[PDB]
Amino acid sequence: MKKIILTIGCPGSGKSTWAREFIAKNPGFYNINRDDYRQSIMAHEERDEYKYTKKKEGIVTGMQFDTAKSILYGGDSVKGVIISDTNLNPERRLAWETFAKEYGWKVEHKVFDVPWTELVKRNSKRGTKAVPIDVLRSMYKSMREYLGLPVYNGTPGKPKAVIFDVDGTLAKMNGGPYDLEKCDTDVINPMVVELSKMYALMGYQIVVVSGRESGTKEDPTKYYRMTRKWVEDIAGVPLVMQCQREQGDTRKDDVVKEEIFWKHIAPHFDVKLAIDDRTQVVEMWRRIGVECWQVASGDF
Amino acid sequence: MKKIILTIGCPGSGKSTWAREFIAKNPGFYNINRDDYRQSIMAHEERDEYKYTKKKEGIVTGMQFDTAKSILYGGDSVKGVIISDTNLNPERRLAWETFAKEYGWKVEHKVFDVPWTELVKRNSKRGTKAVPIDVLRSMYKSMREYLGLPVYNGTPGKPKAVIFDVDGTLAKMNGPYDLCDTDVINPMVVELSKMYALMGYQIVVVSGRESGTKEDPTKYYRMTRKWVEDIAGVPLVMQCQREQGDTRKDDVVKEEIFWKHIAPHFDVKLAIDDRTQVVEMWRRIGVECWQVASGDF
Amino acid sequence: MKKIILTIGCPGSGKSTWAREFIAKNPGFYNINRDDYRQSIMAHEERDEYKYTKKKEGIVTGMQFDTAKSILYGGDSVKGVIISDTNLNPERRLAWETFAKEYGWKVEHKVFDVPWTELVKRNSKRGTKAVPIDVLRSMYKSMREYLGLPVYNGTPGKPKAVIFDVDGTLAKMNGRGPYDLEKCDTDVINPMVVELSKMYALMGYQIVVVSGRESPTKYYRMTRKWVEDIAGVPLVMQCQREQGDTRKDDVVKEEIFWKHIAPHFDVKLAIDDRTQVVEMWRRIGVECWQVASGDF
Amino acid sequence: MKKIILTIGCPGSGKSTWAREFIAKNPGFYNINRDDYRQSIMAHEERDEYKYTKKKEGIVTGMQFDTAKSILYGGDSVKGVIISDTNLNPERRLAWETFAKEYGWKVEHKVFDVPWTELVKRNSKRGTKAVPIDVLRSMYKSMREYLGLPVYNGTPGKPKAVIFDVDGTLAKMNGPYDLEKCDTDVINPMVVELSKMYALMGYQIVVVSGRESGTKEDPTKYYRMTRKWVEDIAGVPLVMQCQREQGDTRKDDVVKEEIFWKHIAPHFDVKLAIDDRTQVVEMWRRIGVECWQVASGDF
Ligand SMILES: [As]
Ligand SMILES: [As]
Ligand SMILES: [As]
Ligand SMILES: [As]
Ligand SMILES: [Mg+2]
Ligand SMILES: [Mg+2]
Ligand SMILES: [Mg+2]
Ligand SMILES: [Mg+2]
Numbered sequence A: 001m002k003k004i005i006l007t008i009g010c011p012g013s014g015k016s017t018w019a020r021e022f023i024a025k026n027p028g029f030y031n032i033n034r035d036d037y038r039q040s041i042m043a044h045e046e047r048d049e050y051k052y053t054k055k056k057e058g059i060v061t062g063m064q065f066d067t068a069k070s071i072l073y074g075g076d077s078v079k080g081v082i083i084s085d086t087n088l089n090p091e092r093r094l095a096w097e098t099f100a101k102e103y104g105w106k107v108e109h110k111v112f113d114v115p116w117t118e119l120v121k122r123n124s125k126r127g128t129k130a131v132p133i134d135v136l137r138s139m140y141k142s143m144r145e146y147l148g149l150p151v152y153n154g155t156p157g158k159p160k161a162v163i164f165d166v167d168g169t170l171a172k173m174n175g176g177p178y179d180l181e182k183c184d185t186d187v188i189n190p191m192v193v194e195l196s197k198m199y200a201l202m203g204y205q206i207v208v209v210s211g212r213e214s215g216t217k218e219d220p221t222k223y224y225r226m227t228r229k230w231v232e233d234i235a236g237v238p239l240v241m242q243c244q245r246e247q248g249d250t251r252k253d254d255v256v257k258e259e260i261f262w263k264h265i266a267p268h269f270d271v272k273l274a275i276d277d278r279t280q281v282v283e284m285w286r287r288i289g290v291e292c293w294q295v296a297s298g299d300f
Numbered sequence B: 001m002k003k004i005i006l007t008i009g010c011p012g013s014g015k016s017t018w019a020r021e022f023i024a025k026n027p028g029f030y031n032i033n034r035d036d037y038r039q040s041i042m043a044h045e046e047r048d049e050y051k052y053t054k055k056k057e058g059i060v061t062g063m064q065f066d067t068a069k070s071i072l073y074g075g076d077s078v079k080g081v082i083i084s085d086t087n088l089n090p091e092r093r094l095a096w097e098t099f100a101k102e103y104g105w106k107v108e109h110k111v112f113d114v115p116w117t118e119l120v121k122r123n124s125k126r127g128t129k130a131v132p133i134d135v136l137r138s139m140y141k142s143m144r145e146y147l148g149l150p151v152y153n154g155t156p157g158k159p160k161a162v163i164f165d166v167d168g169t170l171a172k173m174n175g176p177y178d179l180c181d182t183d184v185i186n187p188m189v190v191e192l193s194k195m196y197a198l199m200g201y202q203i204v205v206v207s208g209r210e211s212g213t214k215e216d217p218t219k220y221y222r223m224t225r226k227w228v229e230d231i232a233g234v235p236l237v238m239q240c241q242r243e244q245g246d247t248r249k250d251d252v253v254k255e256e257i258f259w260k261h262i263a264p265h266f267d268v269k270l271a272i273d274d275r276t277q278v279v280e281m282w283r284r285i286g287v288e289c290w291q292v293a294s295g296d297f
Numbered sequence C: 001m002k003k004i005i006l007t008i009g010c011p012g013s014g015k016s017t018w019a020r021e022f023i024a025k026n027p028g029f030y031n032i033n034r035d036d037y038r039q040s041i042m043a044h045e046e047r048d049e050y051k052y053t054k055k056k057e058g059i060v061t062g063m064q065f066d067t068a069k070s071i072l073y074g075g076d077s078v079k080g081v082i083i084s085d086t087n088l089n090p091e092r093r094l095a096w097e098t099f100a101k102e103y104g105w106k107v108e109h110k111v112f113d114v115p116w117t118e119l120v121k122r123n124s125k126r127g128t129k130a131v132p133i134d135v136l137r138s139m140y141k142s143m144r145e146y147l148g149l150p151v152y153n154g155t156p157g158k159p160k161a162v163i164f165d166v167d168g169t170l171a172k173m174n175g176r177g178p179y180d181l182e183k184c185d186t187d188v189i190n191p192m193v194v195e196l197s198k199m200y201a202l203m204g205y206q207i208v209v210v211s212g213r214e215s216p217t218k219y220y221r222m223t224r225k226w227v228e229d230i231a232g233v234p235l236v237m238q239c240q241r242e243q244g245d246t247r248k249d250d251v252v253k254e255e256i257f258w259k260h261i262a263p264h265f266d267v268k269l270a271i272d273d274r275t276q277v278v279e280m281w282r283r284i285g286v287e288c289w290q291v292a293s294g295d296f
Numbered sequence D: 001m002k003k004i005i006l007t008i009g010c011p012g013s014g015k016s017t018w019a020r021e022f023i024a025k026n027p028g029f030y031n032i033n034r035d036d037y038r039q040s041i042m043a044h045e046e047r048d049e050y051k052y053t054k055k056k057e058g059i060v061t062g063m064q065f066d067t068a069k070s071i072l073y074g075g076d077s078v079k080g081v082i083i084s085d086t087n088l089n090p091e092r093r094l095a096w097e098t099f100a101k102e103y104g105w106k107v108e109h110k111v112f113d114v115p116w117t118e119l120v121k122r123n124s125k126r127g128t129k130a131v132p133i134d135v136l137r138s139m140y141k142s143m144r145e146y147l148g149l150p151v152y153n154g155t156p157g158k159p160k161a162v163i164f165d166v167d168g169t170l171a172k173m174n175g176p177y178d179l180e181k182c183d184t185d186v187i188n189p190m191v192v193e194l195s196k197m198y199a200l201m202g203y204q205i206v207v208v209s210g211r212e213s214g215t216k217e218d219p220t221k222y223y224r225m226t227r228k229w230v231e232d233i234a235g236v237p238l239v240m241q242c243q244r245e246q247g248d249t250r251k252d253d254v255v256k257e258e259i260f261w262k263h264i265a266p267h268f269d270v271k272l273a274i275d276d277r278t279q280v281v282e283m284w285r286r287i288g289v290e291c292w293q294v295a296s297g298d299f
Helices: A015-025 A034-041 A056-072 A090-103 A116-124 A133-147 A190-200 A222-234 A253-265 A279-287 B015-025 B034-041 B054-072 B090-103 B116-124 B133-147 B187-197 B219-231 B250-262 B276-284 C015-025 C034-041 C054-072 C090-101 C116-124 C133-147 C191-202 C220-230 C249-261 C275-283 D015-025 D034-041 D056-072 D090-103 D116-124 D133-147 D189-199 D221-233 D252-264 D278-286
Strands: A003-008 A029-032 A080-083 A106-111 A160-165 A205-210 A239-244 A270-276 A292-294 B003-008 B029-032 B080-083 B106-111 B160-165 B202-207 B236-241 B267-273 B289-291 C003-008 C029-032 C080-083 C106-111 C160-165 C206-211 C235-240 C266-272 C288-290 D003-008 D029-032 D080-083 D106-111 D160-165 D204-209 D238-243 D269-275 D291-293
Touching: A003 A015, A003 A090, A015 A029, A015 A080, A029 A056, A029 B034, A034 A056, A034 B029, A034 B034, A056 A080, A056 A090, A056 B054, A090 A106, A116 A133, A116 A279, A133 A279, A160 A190, A160 A253, A190 A205, A190 A270, A205 A253, A222 A239, A239 A253, A253 A279, A270 A279, A279 A292, A292 D291, B003 B015, B003 B090, B015 B029, B015 B080, B029 B054, B034 B054, B054 B080, B054 B090, B090 B106, B116 B133, B116 B276, B133 B276, B160 B187, B160 B250, B187 B202, B187 B267, B202 B250, B219 B236, B236 B250, B250 B276, B267 B276, B276 B289, B289 C288, C003 C015, C003 C090, C015 C029, C015 C080, C029 C054, C029 D034, C034 C054, C034 D029, C034 D034, C054 C080, C054 D056, C090 C106, C116 C133, C116 C275, C133 C275, C160 C191, C160 C249, C191 C206, C191 C266, C206 C249, C220 C235, C235 C249, C249 C275, C266 C275, C275 C288, D003 D015, D003 D090, D015 D029, D015 D080, D029 D056, D034 D056, D056 D080, D056 D090, D090 D106, D116 D133, D116 D278, D133 D278, D160 D189, D160 D252, D189 D204, D204 D252, D221 D238, D238 D252, D252 D278, D269 D278, D278 D291
Parallel strands: A003 A080, A003 A106, A029 A080, A160 A205, A160 A270, A205 A239, A270 A292, B003 B080, B003 B106, B029 B080, B160 B202, B160 B267, B202 B236, B267 B289, C003 C080, C003 C106, C029 C080, C160 C206, C160 C266, C206 C235, C266 C288, D003 D080, D003 D106, D029 D080, D160 D204, D160 D269, D204 D238, D269 D291
Antiparallel strands: none
């Protein structure tokens, strides 16, 4: 009858803020947190001062389960417990399902799916509770595994290709990209454009992608043609295909380019590489299996 | 080889600051704290939000002992545990010695004796970790019980008396100014001394001013007594005050004057004072106080 | 008209929280604060480290007025400035009105009247921005002067009296919660305080007893039968809290003073226990003797 | 005469911590700070809440100079003032020298040169006083300009080249690698294919590494092992390979910049650098060399 709620989410996804507000509005619920015990057994003031050990982490796991057994063995006043950890490791989630089955408690899951760009923005302002960017990346990968989101592993039988972006990659940025009035030979990124020709003259199919809205309501392909006439004629990129943001799509550069990949690029080509600039997009190709070469500082 | 260190001290005595610095320089030691678990089971952002109930306090006691058993059952890597609580309740200190007797662990005690005036000064700046002044008082009383410090309960056979202070009490506050006239008299308090004396009480006058200087060790004492006896009209039987090179706090000087000169000769039923720290002192050692004005401090 | 808004209120009354929310909702307004400049010229990490000097406070006053002149002597975009200080000193409030009359600006006043009990509760949790209780007292006195609230100085011609509280004073307590109704005996008497009421009654004083208990008059006559018969206090009058008076001990006893006690007696002293009530008698002019630790 | 001390340094370099400790140890000194006034005129509780307006930044500049004139025009008790700003803009530093020349005051400079890697580490833990990574970059660029540190603009006449890195770039990683597990299965396909494609276009392939060259007894043991992998097992057509020395216990950051200025820059016209580790990628980019970061190299 009693519940064991596990919060699933990367650091900064809102787990602690919810757990506090849930216990206030629903009496009988208690919190069990790893970070709280880690900081308590060492008497630390700042959460970043902590250094992991198999011995320390073993004591913390012990404190979690012993406290869970003790609280849930109380009267009918005790409705359940919340484990406000990241719970991104499959072995830890299984350990809580093995534990509930042995004593007759219900395991519930509270998922906190927050976008990557927002998680990084929150982690930079987190202060002493901030995690290194490589561990936040490692955790968003575990979040995608839990959510069941796709990872690319190739497309056998189709031609080999390289994806090129226009936004700050083939086109040198000024200042927030460059104007469509300034589209001449002085806005070309020499080394990157030389790379597209070098790959095209080696059996690779050059697929060009862009985040720029394709057109207006009255003319849906206005900017698409003004971008293709630059990439093909003024830049000299030997492209086989150019798909960009559909007219009227207000979504983030992050999700638009992933959708363009799975719908138009992935089923027709065997993508071996992606040349991009913007950090959030570079992070996206890398986590879904496509290899990236970030050509410039693209922070956003 | 395995210790269970209990920190004894009021909130603000330096327990957490020590525990953190001890675990850093002595590996193998782990911390078990009550406030940390209280804040954790409720998911609170600060200490102040925690509402005390016997059901929550029972779970917290459980977490303390279960974690202590688990950590201490772990080979030669663990040197012991620190219980960074106030440990001012005798029943809780006994429970840790019973736990140690039952599993063969050594209970060590780390005492943090910090003076009252300093504890109040630290508690006012403590913010959200601040405790109500009545609970800080209740805890310093438990600290004195542990330290074995004396509490007055009377002195039978000896004559009944009332202690009166000078500065702020029998003498009005100017702004403690220069040494005085007939206009510096506190009417209602001086009227009280004449009334108690007439009732068969011994008026004992005490003072926080220095008795004299290096050349004359009893200069300011005589100028204070000539005011209390002649200009004020207080029927005193004795006047003991701060000696020569005594540069200590008003707090400890008046407690020493009490135990050495007043307590063995008189049966003190009351103390009329002004300064908060001194008023707090008489009250915790058993003497009753009537604070006549705002004396902050 | 270009404004100069002065915030009037003790530390913890909500001045900074308002000033921030006003500038956000009303563009063109700028803030000038003393504590911010005091902390800035010394490069301090927290405002309890600061040491007040005549040279330093003079520089801070200079920064206030020079910044006010500079901001207000600009475009039609600048609507006015907020001086988020306590402004409890009459000389500083006058200096800002003199400043507005030599350049033609309007001085508006934003009053923050927060009760004493609430100010102390906020100051204990204020942390490093906390002020000593004696300066918070000194400031609430200046707030009462500004608000025009009364201060007692005697009532010549009427009989001299001493006010006595029941719970905590004439009667002992259990710790933190008064004694039960039918549990009032002879062992609940506070010896030294009850002896004092008999002393004063013989000394020509009128003993006025006051209580904070509700209360029909069932609980009132239960209290008076204790004070008069079991305790032996020679009272001339006993006024207490009404049937359903859900207010504070603080304000109820001040009202009982001005309506029933002050016009009939010349109160020379008040014997009380509870800190908030002791603080109340003292600030309105009546002298107090706090008989025990009354924090709550 | 009286001083006007200007602190020069990026946010997180220790300017405020010094200014506080200097005023405590040296009486007569006063602080004038921009961030303090910006936060004060808007009555904000946090620094990240402030929005940059030109009417506002103008009022803040006004408050700075008016307070400086007022404090320094005092008695012989006033010894000087500290301007605890970043002071990375040359126009603002000049404005304080024009001001000091106009009233007869000595301008002193207190430089806070803290390495890039350390500045980023401090900025990630700074909380609400944290600055966006692009503005921290823009500020470290202004710090290099002040310090007079070099920026590459090409090397004409000399042959065109592309710089490659071994660990992480040409070779796949474990999280470094063991010298015994150097197969053909440890090659990064697309990057090694690029070194062959760039050599095919006429670029000189210069390989660099942050790995040790050898032990105490044999100073050139590991250099032979790394080159026998790059040349034979990987198939990279290199013209030169310079790497970290024997007892060089310094950062990957500074070692590769020194290898660039001493051995690579005077002999080749570097058009590009292919690297992996973030700190090294940040280094090539700020000194003028273009980088293509091949993988997540945080670490
Ligand atoms: As373009
Ligand atoms: As005197
Ligand atoms: As009663
Ligand atoms: As290798
Ligand atoms: Mg881009
Ligand atoms: Mg006194
Ligand atoms: Mg009372
Ligand atoms: Mg590398």
